[PDB]
Symmetry: C4
């Protein structure tokens, strides 16, 4: 699986890939950062209740029409056009079409570009539109191309998959254990806040993480003892692999310097 | 506790003890993992309020009868049969009867197998059934035979008994101290949320762990000062032996690799 | 290490000071631990509303009389008698009269022994009885003579006085800063939960410690930004000197080994 | 330690700059510390509802008039006069006038002195006075001249600007991600507590920091899963650069000793 070998990539790839190459490259990087931030702000702003009241045709969050009256649609279209231009230039300057599914920073652009085109295509089994609108948030991840800190975070997450899986596994074990314990310790009352073990999962996760919401809490003596143990075990279980993940992050962090 | 090695049970012990020995061993390990997960899911699902609201057939969550119409009973019986087969094969290949109370990974199977048979026997004071049903959750601990991370967690807990006991001791000391302080600082009011020191134990544990529920909180100036000190001392007391436990976990974790 | 030096109290000092010296010494240590625990449980139990509701017989929690009908008074008197006997023996074996400000493990006994006698004398202005009954809780600290862990905790606290003071100083700085910020950011509304900066002190301490109660929370945009900064700065400020205190504890902990 | 250049600056500068130089210098340092604390207490006390309710007379908290009847105005005027005297003496005795815009310990005095004079000038929109009163709290930062711990904290903050920025960046990324996820997972109900993504920003910050308020919480299954992930990712994101900041603090802390 060799590279395309077009011999056409070099100039545009250097212009749009290395911000330090030239002054125009730095200008392009700054413009890209501002466009990403503008798209993020617009995405967060379309959800405000000021605009939701006057809105198949509603799950999209924007009105696609020839007139293009919605300012949010205008901003989203401009940002999507810029992202499309960037991706097309880089891909026509990207030799390794085979390694396209290996680089995360290009499938990130794919993810940031796909939702608009799916919504346009489907305008011309129902939760699909909501799922796409949710996936559209991953345009936040496109800032990783411009920030080395997010790249180090990505490398840390890649290197700490085993420790992250262990953290999730220990959380699952403790959540099941303490949810069962608190459900059975607070089962013989009508005022209990734990109708079921899956309903106690939420309380268990909230207590182990030591977040603490108060939406559901133990009321019995045994339930309170179980909650005490839940808090202690949550502290311990979280503290076990977090130092390993932190050491990975520090190694990848001071490696660049 | 190794296998007898009589040259007759050797094949069965190799199949049911070393998943990496052969392809069928890996299949058996995967089937065991799926059966354990199925049992956990079924156990968590019988408690859903779909069935409890329409209330020995009630405290157990499953109806033992000739017809055997309950699907949850069918799933539990299948999982218990598989666990019974596994334990019987391994014990028939396990010589060391003297170390019956020493091995944890086989008394775990005993614990996962016992509640079903006690409930069957006792179907033919009253909190015994609830205690048995609560103990039945420990089939979650049976996943430790297949995951090395849970084995490392068990080794860490065994190696950090003194530090864990010190953590619990410091928690008890601080809880008594701050429960007394907040009870006495918030005693001369009709709206106090601390009827007694044992009732302030819950608030103390919640504050020292920094979970934070809001179900009971100080309302006086002295009570708020006491709660401030409670939060600070809880952070400090938890942070004292957790690094020792974490160092133990990291040692046992990087020991395997 | 040296003897009491009285030339007479050597045998009693060996019996009552070194639990490992002989079997009777271990018996005395176990009896002392049980008596301390019994006193702690009785102190925590006199405050239960089962007994307090029948309403100095209420400010003190025990009725001092010739009949001595109250079981709590009987238990407290027995524990105080045992503590008095221990203190009399050890003080008859304690040389340093002028060292009133230095030794802690004997002024702990002084604190555990005063409240009963001072309340008996003062029975014969009003907050004195409540303050004494609060001080009576420090009998929990008398367990430090029997536990090496609490002794190591005391040595850590003595060695980390500067770092603990820095922690309290940073907490005070951040609490003042964020209390002022959240009071001024949430001042122009009728439903604000921060009537004053000292009233915002409680919210600041709760947020910096990341305990989280919800009794008072920001409701404005600026108040929510201030609370965000408060949580971040609380995490950072707590995390600054806690590692130093933890290193002190670990040094004093592994020193015994 | 540069030359005075005036033939007059040296003596006053040594008196008002080095507390350990002489007894009067230590007296001046103690008086300055007491004056700073008195000003802080007065500032925190003017906001109490006892005084604010019975009232340009409300935005400032003090009435500037010839009579000067307000005790809070008297205390603030005395503290401002002392700060003015200190700053004028030090500036008259300060050789390096060039580094005034770079030195932080003198612009801190400028910030502590400016609000009083601006309010006096403006007495002789409306949010300007409130902003000035809020800025007036930075007199808390003037204690850094007298405490070496706050100086070490300042050096740590200056040395850990990149890591602090990374912490804020990761917090922003996670907050946007989880706010969008929880808004979309809890959108199709009448009782949703997340009207918009910016309204979910508060919940995200509260959950990632593990503070936990309960003012808004997920109610759906998907919302609860999103909140679980939010708590886990908040723990991880906070734990990534905090050890680097703590190492910076420890380096600057043991450097002095």
């Amino acid at each position: 699986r060799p590279l395309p070998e077009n011999e056409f990539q070099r100039q545009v790839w250097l212009l749009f890939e290395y911000p330090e190459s030239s002054g125009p490259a730095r200008i392009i990087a700054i413009v890209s950062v501002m466009v990403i931030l503008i798209s993020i702000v617009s995405f967060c702003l379309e959800t405000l209740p000021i605009f939701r009241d006057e809105n198949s045709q509603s799950t999209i969050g924007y009105q696609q029409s020839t007139s293009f009256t919605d300012p949010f649609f205008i901003v989203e279209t401009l940002c999507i056009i810029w992202f499309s231009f960037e991706f097309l230039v880089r891909f026509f300057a990207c030799p390794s079409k085979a390694g396209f599914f290996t680089n995360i920073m290009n499938i990130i652009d794919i993810v940031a570009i796909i939702p608009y085109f799916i919504t346009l295509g489907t305008e011309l089994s129902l939760a699909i539109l909501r799922v796409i609108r949710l996936v559209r948030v991953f345009r936040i991840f496109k800032l990783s191309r411009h920030s080395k800190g997010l790249q180090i975070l990505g490398q840390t997450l890649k290197a700490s998959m085993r420790e992250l899986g262990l953290l999730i596994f220990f959380l699952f074990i403790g959540v099941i254990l303490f949810s069962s314990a608190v459900y059975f310790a607070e089962a013989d009352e009508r005022d209990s806040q734990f109708p079921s073990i899956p309903d106690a999962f939420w309380w268990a996760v909230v207590s182990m993480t030591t977040v603490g919401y108060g939406d559901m809490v133990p009321t019995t003596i045994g339930g309170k003892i179980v909650g005490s143990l839940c808090a202690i075990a949550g502290v311990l279980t979280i503290a076990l692999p977090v130092p390993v993940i932190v050491s990975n992050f520090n190694y990848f962090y001071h490696r660049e310097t």
